[PDB]
Amino acid sequence: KPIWEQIGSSFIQHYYQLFDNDRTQLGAIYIDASCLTWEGQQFQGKAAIVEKLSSLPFQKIQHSITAQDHQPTPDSCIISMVVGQLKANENPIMGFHQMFLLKNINDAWVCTNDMFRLALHNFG
Amino acid sequence: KPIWEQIGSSFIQHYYQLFDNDRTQLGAIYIDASCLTWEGQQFQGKAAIVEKLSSLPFQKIQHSITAQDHQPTPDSCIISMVVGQLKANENPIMGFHQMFLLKNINDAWVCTNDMFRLALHNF
Known about the structure:
The structure is a homodimer.
Chain A: H1 3-22, E1 30-38, E2 41-44, H2 46-55, E3 61-72, E4 78-88, E5 94-104, E6 109-118
Parallel strand pairs in A: 1-6
Antiparallel strand pairs in A: 1-2, 3-4, 4-5, 5-6
């Protein structure tokens, strides 16, 4: 596995680990100039993003990754495309798609761009 | 609408028109450092990318955009995410999501990263 996949699959395992355990700690992987698009809604900067993710009405949420693709960018960045399932609260399982653009800053891979979108169960 | 927005949706519209009407002309939006991951398979470089897209058994295929989100990046690139459906030949309608990272080189917008995956669920 190339190094970008190793770094990439490592970043999303971490991301979903924190998201599922304590999403208030997610501010560490985002910077001031980070952009988030959540179901069409836009937020910029660490505070707004973490505030939006923390506002979510659920107490318990669990992500399950069905597939993830990684690639390096000419600017030495890394793009990750994830597809999966999520269980929030007592809600029926729901498929999801998510994109992360990662950049190395101070020997640390941070997310500058994040796009998330929900699917539709259609089953059950 | 902000400029990255205008660039993004414009590139996306232009990319599907090319893909559905003259794929051999798709190479022009790619450069040598462009990366394509098609349904899981990785292709790197314009030559390999053009080879893959052209070999697709798409006799009469058509893409219909369900939704698209655009964002500007710190390095002034544009990242676009698309959701929609695609119809090929007689084959039944299919779902899909695609990601495009755009960069302006030689004062022209090219695609450096492309990721495509089919989908059985809709939006």
